[PDB]
Design a protein around this ligand. Structure first.
Ligand SMILES: C1=C/N(CCN2CCOCC2)CCNc2ccn3ncc(c3n2)-c2cccc(c2)O/1
Ligand code: NA
Length: 329
């Protein structure tokens, strides 16, 4: 019933181990460790009058959708009829009050020195400033940064199957659309499991992992519903979102607006198909693999992913793809 200080989320040792791993106009993303386990910390300023990274801060009302959707997708790992671990776990959410911790500014500076930042140094916040702090499971490294790091197109097959299954399960349970599943929002982490498990409308199956587990992240533009209450980001009056160029990613925003007639409250699971097509397109055109297809068996995998690319836009949802597409048989 009141905000907490930063130290409540980030006690001294946890704060000392923070390293910055990402950013956006929204704010900052740090990795840290507690109980021997990495976690990702996403920090968003809210409710204040300062521009931050050139944009106005969201209100608490405007941040609730991301919080709600993060929780619902996290909970899918523990459900029965519609179960998937292909989203990202949500450990906690806090409303914090205070100026930015100097130890986080230290991490911010290190990232700016080594990778470079597009953001303002977050050193201008007063002691009444509010933030949302989301703590997530650490999901690994994004697909874009793994452009040159994957073994083969067999790995790409696994990734696309994992993504399609997770989206299908969320469609079935929550009438979910991600709406921004660019390759920076697909994370990859090593697993020793040979196969991954999901359940779609009570029917369980498995996916060969190729040694990686996929997590879909970042629900800032996503949509879902429960008992007819729809949670979403109304981008109907956004200009900039629909005028990008130089990557198929930017066409997906326009294609979604075409599909939904600019009515973002509606359910159009074809948007998940569009994102999966964009990701397949990435796999075939921008990813480069350590081992190219040699064997009959691998060459068949390549042909099957090409087939997927040229046919998948004729499916109505991730659910339709998973259940009917030959790629997953
Ligand atoms: C922010 C994503 N960032 C990218 C921001 N984009 C903003 C738009 O422009 C491109 C960058 C960090 C990505 N890396 C990363 C790494 C490990 N992890 N492990 C978990 C996340 C997580 N995130 C994560 C979970 C939920 C939401 C989330 C991150 O939200
Ligand atoms: Na996951």
């Amino acid at each position: 019933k009141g905000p907490v200080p930063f130290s409540h989320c980030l006690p001294t040792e946890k704060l000392q181990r923070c390293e910055k791993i990402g950013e956006g106009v929204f704010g900052e993303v740090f990795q840290t460790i507690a109980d021997h386990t990495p976690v990702a910390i996403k920090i968003i300023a809210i409710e204040g009058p300062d521009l931050v990274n050139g944009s106005h801060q969201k209100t608490f009302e405007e941040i609730l959708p991301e919080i709600i959707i993060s929780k619902e997708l996290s909970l899918l790992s523990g459900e029965v009829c519609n179960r998937t671990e292909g989203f990202i776990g949500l450990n906690s959410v806090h409303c914090v009050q205070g100026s930015y911790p100097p130890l986080l500014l230290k991490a911010w500076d290190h990232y700016n020195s080594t990778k470079g930042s597009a953001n303002d140094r977050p050193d201008f916040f007063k002691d009444d400033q509010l933030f949302i702090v989301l703590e997530f499971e650490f999901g690994g490294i994004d697909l874009e940064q793994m452009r040159t790091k994957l073994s083969s197109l067999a790995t790409a097959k696994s990734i696309l199957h994992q993504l399609t299954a997770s989206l299908a399960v969320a469609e079935a349970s929550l009438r979910f659309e991600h709406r921004d599943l660019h390759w920076g929002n697909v994370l990859l982490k090593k697993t020793s499991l040979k196969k991954l498990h999901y359940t779609l409308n009570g029917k369980s199956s498995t996916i060969p992992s190729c040694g990686l587990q996929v997590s879909i992240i970042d629900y800032t533009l996503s949509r879902l519903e429960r008992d007819g209450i729809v949670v979403f980001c109304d981008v109907s009056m956004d200009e900039d979102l629909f005028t990008g160029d130089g990557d198929y990613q930017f066409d997906i925003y326009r294609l979604m607006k075409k599909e939904n007639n600019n009515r973002w409250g509606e359910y159009h699971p074809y948007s998940n198909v569009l994102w999966l097509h964009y990701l397949t397109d990435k796999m075939l055109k921008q990813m480069t693999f350590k081992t190219k297809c040699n064997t009959p068996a691998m060459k068949q995998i390549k042909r099957k992913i090409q087939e997927f690319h040229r046919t998948m836009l004729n499916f109505s949802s991730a659910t339709d793809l998973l259940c009917q597409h030959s790629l997953f048989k």
